[PDB]
């Protein structure tokens, strides 16, 4: 048994539809192979994969953060534009692959548009600098009648793009990282960045690099520094963070989103630490731009040799307790919808990804796609407060563990209230009972479940054994809405009226 | 109009009873002529004024700070131990006096005792250092048979102090400060005292301090590198706030509660930042251990010679409207009640106080003393979260300031909700509507109401036209409180049953 | 020091014991004797620092003729101990330590100590510490900034390690 207060009056803030959006690395095969396949049979006169494309309008992404990722700290913007014949090859040292550039940043803009998603454009602050930085926005937002902006004209695309929402740099903290910078290496050149990027267009929003994960040596220290060189300049901070089930523990492994929910609270409180310190008005958000599960994967990446196009890394093959972790993050970040503005699931065409591809081949989507979906499509709105009683569990690395994660999502436009709930219970059901006198009139539309009985079951081009159906349980009776949520279930109890 | 949602289940937290504390410093009549007055007529046999004990009970103090204050910081504790005759006549250089030391700490201790408050003991780490820190702790604290504990036995006093909750210094940060230290300096003396005191008794608390004010140049910057500093030996982080109506605006005087919300939201937020860094599982909470209305006697202290014994510093005589602020103060604790577990207003007596004094003669209640009354006499139990819809208003210095101040305290062990309100309207009646559903069998109690005419009256030892009424018109029907809080008032609403 | 009723009782904070101080340095500087060994005495830069280090090197090895020689003297011992080897502190860069320094803060007292003590009594040697152990995350860095500091007056830099079998 849980108990949860949905009180329409007690909200925590709007969902910006950005924290449903994802991300498209030149990695691996999630562009060539990926949402560019020239000669495939579902392939449109530019070489996109249209199956593809509905995969992602199904999503219904609002956001996608491009080139990178690893890949944008030693790459040259001016290498995938123009005719195709100038463009060089070039040893991407990030993943260690040789890249033609045949994609470059115009065609993916003509993708961007098909799937109707924005670009988060990221500039390369490794190898490169303020200069390029001014030079890449002014070709893609300045309309004519200079040297750049010409240039995108002659190149065939006379409207300007008119990117609103541009990273500085790529994961600078890390040791891995092309051109590498400390905090206040960082935090110097991306405020210098930032500076003539919006002198070009003062339409933009800037995100400034976080720490590449919350276990960095230099966590919270970096997004200090960092924000304190360019508090005034920017209007975001990124974190980034991936989990994986490495020791086999399921219980532990669901709970890892309270970690997820310490580290946003964790850079809220670096950002409004700033803020007071600058004495600032503007309040700074949080750009979560890559999230997801990473780590089947990490055995077969290592017998890769290095140098060839478009390689099958990262492909890792989710299952089902991976779905309810998702499930588990997509709630978070709805929980933290007042200071979490974007995110990004990372990343969404075959490398680590709800859609995976074959070549000459079928589309198909993993176990994870489902609460993504969910989530994107009926996750608009004002997040309310939960007010929540569940039963809660120990595991190896957290305590006072709730078996239930849930949210509800109230959209007075639709008229819908949306419970997004997961039961974290390994053996049995919740029965969970909400609180609804606040909406008057509403009644269950729809229960939807996504439950199997093996959490390492997974899904394929030939067969989706994890798949939801609608049989939940969910009734309305005396202001009260009862559900059973069956053991390591995801559930999308929606009300209307 | 203005409408709150009294909901049991949505909670902040246990107000921790130290919100109502407060401080004296020996700092102008304070102690000498405050307290303390061998020559009264109502003193008793140790010479504390038994008129000023009686005032002091009825507030229900449960902490108070002691002996500063800028006066610590030059301050030896053995000075002011041991037989009279023995005791020092020092320059205090914080106040220009003349400090005889005829009140040492064990005699404040036997006032504390009157009065009914543990003390929370300031150590002076402006000219003294950890060797003094340890011998203080071990003087008040271990039982017997070391020197320093043998000499507190030897002064009369059997039985430890057993002082729970101490300050490592005072207001280090402060130009004006005696042995001034910058964060780093203050941060390495504070960790390697506080490791001292601990190690003679394990079971203290400490609080490092905080900016002398938000106005700092070294605001926030400061409190960062302190908790850095001292984070895994400390409890508690200090904030200093005081207001002043220096430009006869009202509207934007009574809004100055917003500030100080602003205030510890910051602090919080760097001691969640300092947290996050070294990957704690510990919580710094909060210690808002000066506050207060303080401006009116600024031009008289002027006037002061130095070097005289207790001269008259600091003496404000308190209005109607700075009891309203004072009250919106509170209740700004009391919405904090998850971070802030202390607070001592500073100060108890004759020094910006609720309580004077006349030599010689009476002691009498400031207007601040009633809302002060209110808040510690009814405001134990659970805060709870407010989810207010008020009408609002813009001054110079704030914008959508709401005219309703409110918030709810539920005492389950006595079995009441008391409603702590301020309608800030200059001109009209506020009409608040409670829904307390939640509250089954309640009913009104009784509806306190502070107000008067004229924003800028006092009183006196004369008269009080300053003084609570119960006539409020509270009323509970069908599950909603309905109340007419006044123009400029002061509003305790408490339910029952 | 001197009569043993004018002796404190003392908290010893770095083993959580009383202190009687029943034995002092001149009782120890006794046994010494009997066993025939010279003593490495060291100094306290935990909570003391220059002013009483340049005193016990005064009071045990200055022969007469000041307050602390004559003192050392009058407690019954006439002829200085004349120690030769000396501690400039213990273990200073442990975060368990009374009065811990970093290598900076205790580089520099070192080096001030360390001049005061040999303008007492220039036949002396110092030891400056060095980390409490190789695994301090300090170890090495430590040692390169403390005698960086302490080079010209200093004559040894200590080392310490402790093993064990606990698998």
Redesign the interface.
């Known amino acids: 048994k849980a108990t949860m207060?949905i009180?329409k009056?007690?909200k925590i803030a709007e969902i910006d539809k950005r924290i449903y959006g994802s991300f498209i690395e030149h990695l691996g095969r999630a562009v060539y192979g990926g949402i560019y396949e020239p000669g495939h049979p579902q392939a449109d006169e530019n070489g996109f994969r249209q199956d593809v494309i509905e995969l992602v309008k199904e999503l219904q992404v609002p956001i996608i953060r491009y080139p990178g990722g690893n890949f944008v700290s030693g790459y040259n913007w001016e290498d995938g534009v123009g005719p195709k014949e100038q463009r060089p090859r070039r040893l991407d040292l990030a993943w260690k692959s040789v890249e033609t550039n045949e994609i470059g940043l115009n065609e993916f803009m003509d993708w961007a548009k098909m799937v109707g998603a924005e670009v988060n454009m990221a500039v390369n602050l490794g190898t490169r600098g303020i200069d390029a930085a001014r030079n890449l926005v002014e070709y893609c937002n300045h309309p004519s009648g200079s040297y750049y902006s010409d240039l995108r004209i002659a190149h065939g695309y006379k409207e300007p793009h008119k990117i609103k929402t541009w990273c500085l740099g790529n994961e600078m903290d890390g040791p891995w990282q092309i051109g590498h910078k400390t905090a206040v290496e960082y935090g110097r050149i991306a405020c210098e960045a930032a500076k003539v990027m919006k002198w070009v267009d003062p339409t933009i929003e800037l995100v400034v690099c976080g720490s590449s994960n919350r276990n960095m040596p230099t966590?919270?220290?970096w997004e200090?520094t960092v924000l304190d060189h360019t508090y005034d300049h920017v209007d975001y901070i990124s974190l980034h963070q991936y989990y994986g089930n490495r020791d086999n523990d399921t219980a532990n492994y669901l709970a890892l989103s309270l970690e997820m929910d310490?580290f946003i609270?964790?850079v809220?409180?670096?950002?409004?630490?700033?803020?007071?310190?600058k004495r600032s008005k503007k309040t700074i958000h949080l750009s979560f731009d890559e999230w997801n599960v990473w780590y089947h994967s990490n055995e077969a990446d290592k017998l890769i040799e290095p140098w060839t196009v478009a390689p099958p890394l990262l492909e890792d093959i989710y299952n089902f307790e991976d779905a309810l972790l998702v499930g588990c993050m997509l709630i978070t970040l709805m929980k933290h919808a007042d200071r979490v503005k974007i995110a990004c699931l990372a990343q969404l065409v075959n490398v680590i990804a709800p859609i995976m591809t074959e070549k000459n081949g079928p589309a198909w989507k993993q176990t994870i796609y489902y609460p993504f979906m969910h989530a994107s499509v009926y996750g608009r709105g004002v997040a309310l407060?939960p007010?929540i009683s569940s039963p809660k569990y120990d595991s190896k690395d957290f305590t006072d563990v709730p078996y239930l994660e849930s949210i509800a999502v109230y959209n007075e436009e639709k008229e819908e209230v949306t419970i997004f709930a997961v039961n974290r219970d390994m053996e049995d059901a919740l029965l969970l009972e909400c609180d609804v006198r606040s909406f008057e009139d509403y009644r269950v539309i729809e229960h939807i479940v996504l439950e199997h009985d093996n959490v390492k079951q997974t899904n394929s081009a030939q067969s989706s054994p994890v798949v939801p159906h609608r049989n939940g349980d969910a009734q309305l009776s005396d202001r009260k809405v009862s559900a059973t949520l069956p053991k390591l279930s995801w559930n999308v109890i929606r009300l209307g009226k």
Request: no cysteine; aromatic share 14%; charged share 35%.
């Open positions: 207060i009180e009056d007690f966590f919270a220290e200090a310490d609270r964790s809220v409180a670096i950002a409004d630490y700033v803020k007071a310190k407060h007010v």
